[PDB]
């Protein structure tokens, strides 16, 4: 019950509210003045219970009607203020809003923080309740926001300000209202909220954050959000606005990492240095330094990688003297991938022709591509060795050499463009293998280029009726992955015409799946323009109509997180009815690629995939491991590996094959000794089937990629920056792997080399302002945010001290433990430039 | 093989602030859960073979199915099986049974009427052991532990790093530590660290009290310990946490005490499981005890327990970290200076800091305040801290 | 009366603990004097409701699980749960108002209003 | 002081409302329905079908299984206690059905009276209890699992510093077996039992593992948890059947690991004590030595607390030789360091004599822990070679960090 002070205050409140019965002149001003005074005193204090509000439980009906009849001036406004404060505690949402709306304006700050928050919530509720039928109510709510937002800004309440500004769908005022000490908080809030908000508000929020960062001149972050938006005009605007040459070099490094090559005018000083950095010619050299820091110059051999000295030699000296072709292809992939990018191998460099001569047709192409893939990012160094094998006796393997070129020029660009020159006279080659090699090399060398000359040169291949189905598919995929995430009308129209003119009998083959691929590869991350795409694709008949629609639906929403598209895809998967299950497989890959945008969505996609596996039909069971591989590329999560190990022994050969490839992709480059042991056990168990052995050895090569210093992650910048080229590469490999026997185990091993398009390295090489390497002590650990929305860089814990260059595993980041240097980019990934601290004093 | 049964956990939703970002992440979780529900509801609804297989096998075996103990395998289809009443019967082994699974002492499903071997029971796990397995991972994570960097690093190198990165251990040649005892004054973070590692680990986790592994009947104690460790072996990557090992880890000594000798037999079986004849495999053991000096040397010796992680009373930096973590969900005022609580030598532990925060919240609620102040914390310090009586000598020492 | 008589002549049903469900159609139970039995489940009884250690009832003919029944409690532990509440009152406690409020801050406030 | 006022319902409503409620209600409801949804998924899947011995369909494919079920009949196992032999024409047979009862039955016409000898176990029909089939003699399952049948990979070169202990062990468990002629010529009966005792971690179980590794005879690793049975006298019967199985094998080896478990001291002032465990220990004592000579059964026993053993068991007629494992000397500790650092990726300049001298009173297990900790230190800072400083830090972390409280100011007392 009450107290003496409480009872006296209750009596005073009751007297003040009861005096309003009649219309005496000295009632409305005195009583409302007293109520205003008490309410303001209680509300403008600590969060203590508002004692006047607790005591006040009257009815305002008489108060509302008298409001209607008495004092059209300020007294009704005082009454409105009082009833608004009273109804903030009660449930009078619309009335409580309109009391502040039409009553005494004064200011929302004069009431209290809680009153401001409640008014903000009610304003958001009304705005969501108000449609475009009338804009009369919108303007006063906007005026309320005009004062609500600065209140939150000045009282560290940026949460409510940002939320309200997202409800009203208007975010322009953040440009003119954000302070120096609060830009990071709101910017991080937006860059985290963009992933979960659906279309089209995510793009508006992204451009709002872009404008904020431009206003505060945080140019690297502006570049990050510009690549998030995937629009070149604002990237060019940021490039022009960058007046600091060190920031220019940093943004060139990040552009090269993302693979975005924008033409630079000669008006910008130091054009040559920026161009050569963006071409990423230096990377290999740094990689070499990397390797000579870890004493891993010496390349490995497949015999030691398989560890034959440990396998139980049940048949000794009688069952291993025969060298089958398929195991030779697997050993080529191993003695490639494992030793790749180190500039040397002990079996393909000194005994090349002898090795290649024990391969047949497809083995020739695979080994020729692996010869270039054993030396990465050295265009001249790679081609100096590739030319002789291009001059080979078996001119059919010439195409393979082109792959080598295309696999050597990957991740780099030259002014003279050796790849374009070398393949310009070979693209029009009538031989199917020659044209295939030419187009594949051109695509791999020019991933993400979007250069009009190469696209125009690739156009006539689609209209060539002579060109075979697999030539058409490889051409379509190369065109798509040269024009990743651009919605190029030229390529879209060309592929649409090619598929429209294609016959059903010729469409029934597996390679026709690669026709939507490039089309889909033209529309990565842009789901707005795909209504016309689906309308155009609706002309073709089912089932391939549904197949193409599903594939373009995946490609449109790559990482979008649109749960409605995932619901449609899950409905497709759950429909229990050969080619009919292709739709379900593509939809499963769609759930994977949409959910990999967000960590939460991905981890729930894990549970959905488990449910699909334990309760799905054979086609879904085959499809899921590819999805699991897509979800966690180069992220050896133990639960995923355990599920894949459980299903590697399944009685369905396709399911086991897909599970093995999922081991290879998920644990790629992590050098996981547990994964290596499990793969050795799988090789021992599957020692009889050539296909299982081939794919398990491929998985071992993938997991020993670069001796553990290479990753296939399509994500960068704390996994927030997507990579269109890498996403394209994994998409091609996975959709080809939807049919392992006909494509992977058939005539199309070269498709595996598309993963090298996604081949991106991990280091911590630190450069000075002049780009010389600089050893800096670095604190490396997990980025587990021990705070909420404090704006912290996840507050790296699990500390370990390192000297650069350093190797960072997936999910573990780094920070500068020394204040002597300041990084231009606060995200310590890849090559960075540290400016000497001017604030530090000796 | 029977790979690990890792506990399931929902993704962490951060920030923990009551903002729209938390709403969006939680609603994404709800979306995906509803997707799973819709798929799992429409799966069996659209299900239109093996039914003949079931109608034959189940009819042949019939219900109920008795559970007996295999004793001898006479022929390829005849076996001497002892029923639970201890009576042996020469019964037949039906065709639909894997002859390689039958081993002496195995649990075998028999027909109710003719007791013929109709199948083999695989698990036959003691209910007191299957309850030790953790199904719901605890919510406490490594981000909820203030300070304790050395202790967390040691426990990660022991039970976490070998699972994720066995490459270092295999390359250098070390066998990773397979036994850790978390010892120190109470309320320092031993059980909290066990909760955190259980949350983080991808391997199966078994939680023991060090006293539930003790049974009434004469031989069921060591047998229960053996069953628990065998279950840990089954799910190969395993972590066996035995809180309050003091209950059984006490030092061996000679007395009549007919129950104490069984106590010592149980602890002897435990140390045999830890390191005795035959290898232990890839199962780690985490032990916690307030008093370590009272433990038997043969239990905490290296090889059985490789690491002894000390949990001291938190220092100034650690105490400040505890206060920052445990008031993160609070709404602190501007007049609060936590430093005064962190300084002085009250010898307050992490649990003491948690109680201080809780009592400060209660003090604020007493004044009808949802935001705490410095005075509330000061009152809570004296209100809660009154634990020890004297603990100190007089003014002898200058 | 006739229905009571007819229900009476029905054989008494065994009561057995539950180790775990096995099939969504069979349950591993443990009767008092004999050992374990893998038994069928009644049509009305749902498998997702028979949890381990739940003390089901099995028919005397085929040991069919027909009732879920209340959970087992060690007879000695059940005697520790008070049924007839005592007669003491807060108004019968003198001089401990501060103590009463302090204890009720833990025994009443959290359970009644955990939202605070 | 001012008494705390009660919290009225209006106050509760205000505190739970006058604050964050824009998203608090929605967040809480979403969390609650998330928990309910998780429960729904778990319930709706909720099977995890238990594995049962269902063979692959092609394995059985037998519609004659029902024919075997109905045609063949179950037989209860019972040992023929006695032959009555009334007139050698209606002989009668007294059988004992385990614990059921004992009966006077006759054989079925299928079997011959000469094929059913006294004392063996036979199958009897469940109705007329007539003998139907002779059975092989009972072999306890757990007793046959007590055997090792899988030699561990611990050789004798992995036990450093125990040269005398190894030689005395091989003198009792290896030499009298491989080359018995070296003893009978001198008329010496070699000891038939060895008690391995010493500080924990000194290498008793390691030496037992080496013995089992190169035994070449029947090795039985007795489990101390199985001699301890629920029912009265079952542990004694366990010992009897174990010794009988050992006698069946030619010159078997038995290793009672951790003998303190069932080798306590007999007593009666405790008003009952163990009794059953004491009875099992007494039967083991009887089997070891006494009437009914044990035979060629060399017995291995290990315990790192020997002072609690029964003097009757400790008497040198059951455990004749008492090999003691002591803390290794400097040379032995150097040998242990070299053994345990053999596979490590360490430097070639490590002075292992220094490290051995830095651990004065340390068992071999502590040396292994020191090596592992040196590797851990070399891993923490990611060096691929473990240097001398890493080993010194490991020695400080393992030995000195937990040895005593003799701090450096207190350690200044010695120079
Ligand atoms: N270092 C710490 N960081 C954060 N919270 C801590 C810390 N130490 C203790 N706590 C808090 O104290 C609570 C109780 O401590 P905990 O359960 O870890 O006890 P303990 O050290 O295992 O003690 P005991 O000897 O009773 O087993 C934890 O739930 C946690 O919230
Ligand atoms: N001389 C030695 N050489 C090498 N390693 C040794 C030596 N002595 C002991 N060890 C190590 O000690 C470890 C554990 O010792 P062990 O198992 O023999 O203990 P124990 O003394 O029998 O103790 P308990 O009292 O538990 O029976 C072994 O794994 C082995 O690596
Ligand atoms: Mg605890
Ligand atoms: Mg031992």
UniProtKB/Swiss-Prot annotation, chain A:
Modified residues (N6-acetyllysine): 508
UniProt keywords, alphabetically: Acetylation, Phosphoprotein, Proteasome, Repeat
Per-repeat ranges for PC: 366-399, 400-436, 437-471, 474-508, 517-546, 626-657, 676-691
Region: Required for interaction with UBLCP1, residue numbers: 642-837
GO molecular function terms attached to this record: enzyme regulator activity
Modified residues (Phosphoserine): 104, 318, 320
InterPro entries assigned: 26S_Psome_Rpn1, ARM-like, ARM-type_fold, Proteasome/cyclosome_rpt, RPN1_C, RPN1_N
GO BP annotations listed: proteasome-mediated ubiquitin-dependent protein catabolic process; regulation of protein catabolic process
Assigned GO CC terms: cytosol; extracellular exosome; extracellular region; ficolin-1-rich granule lumen; membrane; nucleoplasm; nucleus; proteasome accessory complex
Pfam families: PC_rep, RPN1_C, RPN1_RPN2_N
Expression by tissue: Found in skeletal muscle, liver, heart, brain, kidney, pancreas, lung and placenta.
Phosphotyrosine PTM sites in chain numbering: 151
Function of the molecule: Component of the 26S proteasome, a multiprotein complex involved in the ATP-dependent degradation of ubiquitinated proteins. This complex plays a key role in the maintenance of protein homeostasis by removing misfolded or damaged proteins, which could impair cellular functions, and by removing proteins whose functions are no longer required. Therefore, the proteasome participates in numerous cellular processes, including cell cycle progression, apoptosis, or DNA damage repair. Binds to the intracellular domain of tumor necrosis factor type 1 receptor. The binding domain of TRAP1 and TRAP2 resides outside the death domain of TNFR1.
Species per Swiss-Prot/TrEMBL record: Homo sapiens
Curated annotation (Swiss-Prot), chain B:
Residues found modified as Phosphotyrosine: 397
Stated name of the protein: 26S proteasome regulatory subunit 4
Primary subcellular site in the record, as a coarse category: cytoplasm
PANTHER family named in the record: 26S PROTEASOME REGULATORY SUBUNIT
GO cellular-component term (any): proteasome regulatory particle, base subcomplex
Positions carrying Phosphothreonine: 14, 392
Name of the gene: PSMC1
PROSITE patterns, per database record: AAA
MF annotations from Gene Ontology: ATP binding; ATP hydrolysis activity; proteasome-activating activity; RNA binding
Gene source species: Homo sapiens (Human)
Biological role stated in the UniProt entry: Component of the 26S proteasome, a multiprotein complex involved in the ATP-dependent degradation of ubiquitinated proteins. This complex plays a key role in the maintenance of protein homeostasis by removing misfolded or damaged proteins, which could impair cellular functions, and by removing proteins whose functions are no longer required. Therefore, the proteasome participates in numerous cellular processes, including cell cycle progression, apoptosis, or DNA damage repair.
UniProtKB/Swiss-Prot annotation, chain C:
Localization per record: Cytoplasm; Nucleus
Post-translational modification Phosphoserine, affected residues: 62
Top-rank taxon, per record: Eukaryota
Similarity comment: family membership: Belongs to the AAA ATPase family.
Subunit record text: Component of the 19S proteasome regulatory particle complex. The 26S proteasome consists of a 20S core particle (CP) and two 19S regulatory subunits (RP). The regulatory particle is made of a lid composed of 9 subunits, a base containing 6 ATPases including PSMC5 and few additional components. Component of a complex with USP49 and RUVBL1. Interacts with PRPF19. Interacts with TRIM5. Interacts with NDC80. Interacts with PAAF1. Interacts, in vitro, with the thyroid hormone receptor (in a thyroid hormone T3-dependent manner) and with retinoid X receptor (RXR). Interacts with ERCC6.
Task of the protein: Component of the 26S proteasome, a multiprotein complex involved in the ATP-dependent degradation of ubiquitinated proteins. This complex plays a key role in the maintenance of protein homeostasis by removing misfolded or damaged proteins, which could impair cellular functions, and by removing proteins whose functions are no longer required. Therefore, the proteasome participates in numerous cellular processes, including cell cycle progression, apoptosis, or DNA damage repair.
Protein name as catalogued: 26S proteasome regulatory subunit 8
Residues of the full protein shown: 59 to 174 of 406
From Swiss-Prot, chain D:
GO molecular function, one term: proteasome-activating activity
Keyword check for Ubl conjugation: yes
GO biological process: osteoblast differentiation; positive regulation of proteasomal protein catabolic process; proteasome-mediated ubiquitin-dependent protein catabolic process; ubiquitin-dependent protein catabolic process
InterPro entries: 26S_Proteasome_ATPase, AAA+_ATPase, AAA_lid_3, ATPase_AAA_core, ATPase_AAA_CS, NA-bd_OB-fold, P-loop_NTPase, PRS7-like_OB
GO cellular component terms listed in the entry, alphabetical order: cytoplasm; cytoplasmic ribonucleoprotein granule; cytosol; extracellular region; ficolin-1-rich granule lumen; membrane; nucleoplasm; nucleus
Complex formation: Component of the 19S proteasome regulatory particle complex. The 26S proteasome consists of a 20S core particle (CP) and two 19S regulatory subunits (RP). The regulatory particle is made of a lid composed of 9 subunits, a base containing 6 ATPases including PSMC2 and few additional components. Interacts with NDC80/HEC; this interaction is detected only during M phase. Interacts and SQSTM1. Interacts with PAAF1. Directly interacts with TRIM5. (Microbial infection) Interacts with HIV-1 Tat.
Descriptive protein name: 26S proteasome regulatory subunit 7
Organism for this UniProt entry: Homo sapiens
């Amino acid at each position: 019950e009450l107290s003496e002070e409480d009872k006296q205050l209750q009596d005073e409140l009751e007297m003040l509210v009861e005096r309003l019965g009649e219309k005496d002149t000295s009632l409305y001003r005195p009583a409302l003045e007293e109520l205003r005074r008490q309410i303001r005193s209680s509300t403008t204090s600590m969060t203590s219970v508002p004692k006047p509000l607790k005591f006040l439980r009257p009815h305002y009906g008489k108060l509302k009607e008298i409001y209607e009849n008495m004092a059209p001036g300020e007294n009704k406004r005082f009454a409105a203020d009082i009833i608004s404060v009273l109804a903030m505690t009660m449930s009078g949402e619309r009335e409580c809003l309109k009391y502040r709306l039409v009553g005494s304006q004064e200011e929302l700050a004069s009431w209290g923080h809680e009153y401001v928050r409640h008014l903000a919530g009610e304003v958001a509720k009304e705005w969501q309740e108000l449609d475009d039928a009338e804009k009369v109510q919108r303007e006063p709510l906007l005026t309320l926001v005009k004062e609500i937002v600065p209140y939150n800004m000045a009282h560290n309440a940026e949460h409510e300000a940002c939320d309200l500004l997202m409800e009203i769908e208007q975010v322009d005022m953040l440009e003119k209202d954000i302070d120096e000490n609060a830009y990071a908080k709101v910017c991080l809030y937006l860059t985290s909220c963009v992933n979960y908000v659906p279309e089209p508000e995510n793009s508006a929020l992204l451009r709002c954050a872009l404008g904020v960062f431009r206003k505060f001149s945080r140019f690297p972050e502006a570049l990050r959000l510009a690549l998030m938006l995937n629009d070149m005009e604002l990237v060019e605007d940021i490039f022009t606005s960058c007046k600091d040459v060190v920031v220019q070099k940093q943004m060139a490094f990040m552009l090269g990492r993302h693979g975005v090559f924008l033409e630079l005018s000669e008006d910008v000083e130091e054009y040559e240095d920026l161009t050569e950095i963006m071409s990423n010619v230096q990377l290999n050299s740094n990689f070499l330094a990397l390797a000579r820091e870890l004493d891993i110059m010496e390349p490995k051999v497949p015999d030691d990688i398989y560890k034959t000295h440990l396998e139980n030699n049940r048949f000794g000296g009688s069952g291993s003297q025969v060298d089958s072709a398929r195991m030779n292809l697997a050993s080529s992939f191993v003695n490639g991938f494992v030793n790749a990018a180190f500039g040397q191998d002990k079996l393909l460099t000194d005994d090349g022709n002898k090795w290649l001569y024990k391969n047949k047709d497809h083995g020739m192409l695979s080994a020729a591509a692996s010869l270039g893939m054993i030396l990465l990012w050295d265009v001249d160094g790679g081609l100096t060795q590739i030319d002789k094998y291009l001059y080979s006796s078996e001119d059919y393997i010439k195409s393979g050499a082109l792959l080598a070129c295309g696999i050597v020029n990957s991740g780099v660009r030259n002014e003279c463009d050796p790849a374009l020159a070398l393949l310009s006279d070979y693209v029009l080659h009538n031989s199917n293998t020659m044209r295939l090699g030419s187009i594949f090399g051109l695509g791999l060398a020019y991933a993400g280029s979007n250069r009009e000359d190469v696209l125009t040169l690739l156009l006539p291949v689609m209209g060539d009726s002579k060109s075979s189905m697999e030539v058409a598919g490889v051409t379509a995929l190369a065109c798509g992955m040269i024009a990743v995430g651009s919605c190029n009308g030229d390529v879209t129209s060309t592929i649409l015409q090619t598929i429209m003119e294609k016959s059903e009998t010729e469409l029934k083959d597996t390679y026709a799946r690669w026709l939507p691929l490039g089309l889909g590869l033209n529309h990565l991350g842009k789901g707005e323009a795909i209504e016309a795409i689906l309308a155009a694709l609706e002309v073709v008949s089912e089932p391939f109509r549904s197949f193409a629609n599903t594939l373009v639906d995946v490609c449109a929403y790559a990482g979008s997180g649109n749960v409605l598209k995932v619901q449609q895809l899950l409905h497709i998967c759950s429909e229990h009815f050969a080619d009919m299950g292709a739709h379900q497989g593509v939809a499963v890959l769609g759930i994977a690629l949409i959910a990999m945008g967000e960590e939460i969505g991905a981890e729930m996609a894990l549970r959905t995939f488990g449910h699909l596996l334990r309760y799905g039909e054979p086609t879904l069971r085959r499809a899921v491991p590819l999805a699991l591989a897509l979800i966690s590329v180069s992220n050896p999560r133990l639960n995923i590996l355990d599920t894949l190990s459980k299903f590697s022994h399944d009685a369905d050969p396709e399911v086991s094959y897909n599970s093995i490839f999922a081991m290879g992709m998920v644990g790629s480059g992590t050098n996981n000794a547990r994964l290596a042991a499990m793969l050795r056990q799988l090789a021992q168990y599957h020692a009889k089937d050539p296909n299982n052995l081939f794919m398990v050895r491929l998985a071992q090569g993938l997991t020993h990629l670069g001796k553990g210093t290479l990753t296939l992650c399509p994500y960068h910048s704390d996994r927030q920056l997507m990579s269109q080229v890498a996403v394209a590469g994994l998409l091609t490999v996975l959709v080809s792997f939807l049919d392992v026997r006909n494509i992977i185990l058939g005539k199309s091993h070269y498709v595996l080399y598309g993963l090298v398009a996604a081949m991106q390295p991990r280091m911590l090489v630190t450069f000075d302002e002049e780009l010389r390497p600089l050893p800096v002590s670095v604190r490396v650990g997990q980025a587990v945010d021990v705070v909420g929305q404090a704006g912290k860089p996840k507050t790296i814990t699990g500390f370990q001290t390192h000297t650069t260059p350093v190797l960072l595993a997936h999910g573990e980041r780094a920070e500068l433990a020394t204040e002597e240097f300041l990084p231009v980019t606060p995200i310590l990934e890849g090559f960075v430039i540290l400016r000497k601290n001017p604030n530090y004093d000796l | 093989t029977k790979g690990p049964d890792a506990a399931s956990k929902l993704p962490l939703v951060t920030p923990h602030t009551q903002c729209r970002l938390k709403l969006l992440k939680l609603e994404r979780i709800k979306d995906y859960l509803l997707m799973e529900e819709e798929f799992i509801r429409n799966q069996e609804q659209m299900k239109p073979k093996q039914e003949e297989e079931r109608s034959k096998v189940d009819d042949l075996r019939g219900t109920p199915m008795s559970v007996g103990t295999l004793e001898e395998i006479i022929d390829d289809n005849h076996a001497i099986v002892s029923t639970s009443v201890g009576s042996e019967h020469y019964v037949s082994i039906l065709s639909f049974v894997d002859k390689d699974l039958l081993e002496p002492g195995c649990s075998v499903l028999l027909n109710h009427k003719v007791h013929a071997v109709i199948g083999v029971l695989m698990d036959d796990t003691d209910p007191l052991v299957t309850v030790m397995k953790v199904e719901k991972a605890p919510q406490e994570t490594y981000a909820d532990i203030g300070g304790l960097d050395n202790q967390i690093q040691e426990i990660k190198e022991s039970v976490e790093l070998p699972l994720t990165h066995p490459e270092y251990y295999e390359e250098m040649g070390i066998k990773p530590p397979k036994g850790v005892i978390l010892y120190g004054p109470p309320g320092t973070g031993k059980t909290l660290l066990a909760k955190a590692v259980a949350n983080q680990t991808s391997a199966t986790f078994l939680r023991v009290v060090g006293s539930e592994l003790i049974q009434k009947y004469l031989g069921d104690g060591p047998k229960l310990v053996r069953e628990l460790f065998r279950v840990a072996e089954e799910h190969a990557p395993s972590i066996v946490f035995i809180d309050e090992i003091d209950a059984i880890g006490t030092k061996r000594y000679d007395s009549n005490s007919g129950g104490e000798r069984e106590i010592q037999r149980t602890m002897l079986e435990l140390l045999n499981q830890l390191d005795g004849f035959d290898s232990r495999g890839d199962v780690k053991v985490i032990m916690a005890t307030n008093r370590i000096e009272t433990l038997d040397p043969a239990l905490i010796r290296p090889g059985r327990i490789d690491r002894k992680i000390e949990f001291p009373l938190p220092d100034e930096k650690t105490k400040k970290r505890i206060f920052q973590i445990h008031t993160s969900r609070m709404t602190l005022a501007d007049d609060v200076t936590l430093d005064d609580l962190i300084m002085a030598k009250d010898d307050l532990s992490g649990a003491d800091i948690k109680a201080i925060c809780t009592e400060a919240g209660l003090m604020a609620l007493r004044e009808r305040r949802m935001k705490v102040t410095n005075e509330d914390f000061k009152k809570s310090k004296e209100n809660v801290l009154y634990k020890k009586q004297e603990g100190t000598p007089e003014g002898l020492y200058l | 009366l006739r229905e009571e008589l007819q229900l009476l002549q029905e054989q008494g049903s065994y009561v057995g603990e539950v180790v775990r469900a096995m099939d969504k159609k069979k349950v591993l139970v443990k009767v008092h004097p004999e050992g374990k039995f893998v038994v069928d489940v009644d049509k009305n009884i749902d498998i997702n409701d028979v949890t381990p250690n739940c003390r089901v009832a099995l028919r005397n003919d085929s040991y069919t699980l027909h009732k879920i029944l209340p959970n087992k409690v060690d007879p000695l532990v059940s005697l520790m749960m008070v049924e007839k509440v005592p007669d003491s009152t807060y108004e019968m406690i003198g001089g401990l108002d501060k103590q009463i409020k302090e204890i009720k801050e833990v025994i009443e406030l959290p359970v009644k209003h955990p939202e605070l | 002081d001012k008494p705390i006022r009660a919290l009225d319902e209006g106050d509760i409503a205000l505190l739970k409302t006058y604050g964050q409620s824009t998203y608090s209600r929605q967040i809480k409801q979403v969390e609650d329905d998330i928990q309910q949804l998780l429960k729904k998924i778990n319930e709706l899947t909720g099977i995890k079908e238990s594995d049962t011995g269902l063979a692959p369909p092609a394995l059985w494919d037998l519609a004659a299984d029902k024919q075997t079920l109905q045609s063949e009949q179950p037989l209860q196992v019972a040992r023929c206690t006695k032959i009555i032999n009334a007139d050698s024409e209606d002989p009668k047979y007294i059988i004992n059905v385990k614990q059921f009862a004992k009966f006077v039955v006759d054989l079925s016409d299928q079997v011959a009276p000469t094929d059913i000898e006294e004392g063996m176990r036979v199958g009897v029909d469940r109705n007329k209890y007539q003998i139907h089939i002779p059975l092989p003699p009972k072999i306890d399952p757990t007793v046959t699992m007590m055997q090792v049948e899988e030699k561990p990979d611990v050789t004798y070169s992995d036990v450093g510093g125990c040269k005398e202990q190894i030689e005395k062990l091989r003198e009792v468990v290896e030499t009298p077996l491989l080359h018995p002629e070296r003893f009978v010529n001198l008329g010496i009966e070699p000891p038939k039992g060895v008690l391995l005792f010493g500080p924990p971690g000194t290498g008793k179980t390691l030496c037992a593992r080496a013995v089992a590794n190169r035994t070449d005879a029947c090795f039985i690793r007795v489990i101390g948890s199985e001699l301890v049975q629920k029912y009265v006298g079952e542990g004694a019967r366990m010992v009897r059947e174990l010794f009988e199985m050992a006698r069946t094998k030619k010159a078997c080896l038995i290793f009672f690991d951790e003998i303190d478990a069932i080798g306590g001291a007999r007593f009666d002032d405790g008003a009952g004590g163990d009794n059953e465990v004491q009875r099992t220990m007494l039967e083991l004592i009887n089997q070891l030595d006494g009437f009914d000579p044990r035979g060629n059964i060399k017995v291995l026993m290990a315990t790192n607390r020997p002072d609690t053993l029964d003097p009757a068991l400790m008497r040198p007629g059951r455990l004749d030789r008492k090999i003691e494992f002591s803390l290794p000397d400097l040379e032995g500790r150097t040998h242990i360091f070299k053994i345990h650092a053999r596979s490590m990726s360490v430097e070639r300049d490590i002075r292992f004599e220094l490290l051995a001298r830095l651990c004065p009173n340390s068992t071999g297990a502590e040396i292994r822990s020191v090596c592992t900790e040196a590797g851990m230190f070399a891993i923490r800072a990611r060096r691929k070679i473990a240097t001398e400083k890493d080993f010194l830090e490991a020695v400080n972390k393992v030995i000195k960090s937990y040895a005593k409280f003799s701090a450096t100011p207190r350690y200044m007392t010695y120079n």
